[PDB]
Amino acid sequence: PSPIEEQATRLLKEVPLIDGHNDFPYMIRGWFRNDINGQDAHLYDMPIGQTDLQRLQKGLLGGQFWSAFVPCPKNPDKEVGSLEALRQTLQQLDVIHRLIERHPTILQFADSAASIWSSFRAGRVASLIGIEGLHQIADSVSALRMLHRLGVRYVTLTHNCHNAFADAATVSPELHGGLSRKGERLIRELNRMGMMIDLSHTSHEAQTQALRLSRAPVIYSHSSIYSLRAHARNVTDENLHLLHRNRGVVMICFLRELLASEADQATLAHVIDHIIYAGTRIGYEHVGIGSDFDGMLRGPDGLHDVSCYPALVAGLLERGVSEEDVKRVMGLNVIRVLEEVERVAAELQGAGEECLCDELDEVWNEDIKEQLTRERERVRKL
Q: Helix crossing, 181-193 with 333-350: angle to 10°?
A: 90
Please tell me which residue in 97, 103, 135, 159 is annotated as part of the active site.
159
Please tell me which residue in 19, 111, 198, 292 is annotated as part of the active site.
292
- Binding residue for Fe ion, selected from 49, 295, 300, 310, defined by CB under 5 A: 295
- Binding residue for Fe ion, selected from 24, 66, 69, 120, defined by CB under 5 A: 69
Is 292 labeled as ligand-binding? yes
Q: What region, left, alpha or beta, does residue 33 occupy, with left being phi > 0 and alpha being psi -120 to 50 degrees?
A: left
Nearest of 107, 109, 93, 105 to residue 28 by alpha carbon: 93
Confirm or reject binding of residue 23 to Fe ion (CB under 5 A).
yes
Length of the chain (residues): 382
In the chain, the amino acid numbered 1 is P
In the chain, the amino acid numbered 344 is V
Query: Judged by CB, which is closer to Fe ion: 69, or 277?
Result: 69
Confirm or reject binding of residue 49 to Fe ion (CB under 5 A).
no
In angstroms, rounded to a whole number, what is the distance separating the alpha carbons of residues 135 and 126? 26
Please tell me which residue in 19, 111, 132, 189 is annotated as part of the active site.
132
Quick check: 234 and 223 in contact, CB under 8 A?
Answer: yes
Q: Which of residues 82-141 bind Fe ion (CB under 5 A)?
A: 132
- Binding residue for Fe ion, selected from 50, 51, 64, 67, defined by CB under 5 A: 67
CA–CA–CA angle 24, 161, 112 (5° rounding) = 45
Residue 305 binds what, of Fe ion, a second copy, none (CB under 5 to 8 Å, by partner type)?
a second copy
Q: What single string gives the DSSP state of each residue in 195-244?
A: PEEE-TTB-HHHHHHHHHH-SS--EESS--BTTTS--TTSBPHHHHHHHH
Q: Does residue 21 carry a catalytic annotation?
A: yes
Is 340 labeled as ligand-binding? no
Maximal C-alpha separation, the chain: 87
| Chain residues in the site for a second copy (CB under 8 A) | 29-31, 33-35, 37-38, 46-50, 71, 77, 79-80, 83-84, 86-87, 90-91, 93-95, 97-98, 138, 140, 142-143, 145-146, 149-150, 297-298, 304-305, 354-355, 357-360, 362-364, 369, 371-373, 375-376, 379, 382
Annotated catalytic sites, by residue? 21, 23, 132, 159, 201, 222, 292
Chain residues in the site for Fe ion (CB under 5 A): 23, 67, 69, 132, 295
Residues in the annotated binding site = 21, 23, 132, 159, 233, 292
Binding-site annotation: residue ranges for substrate: 159, 233, 292
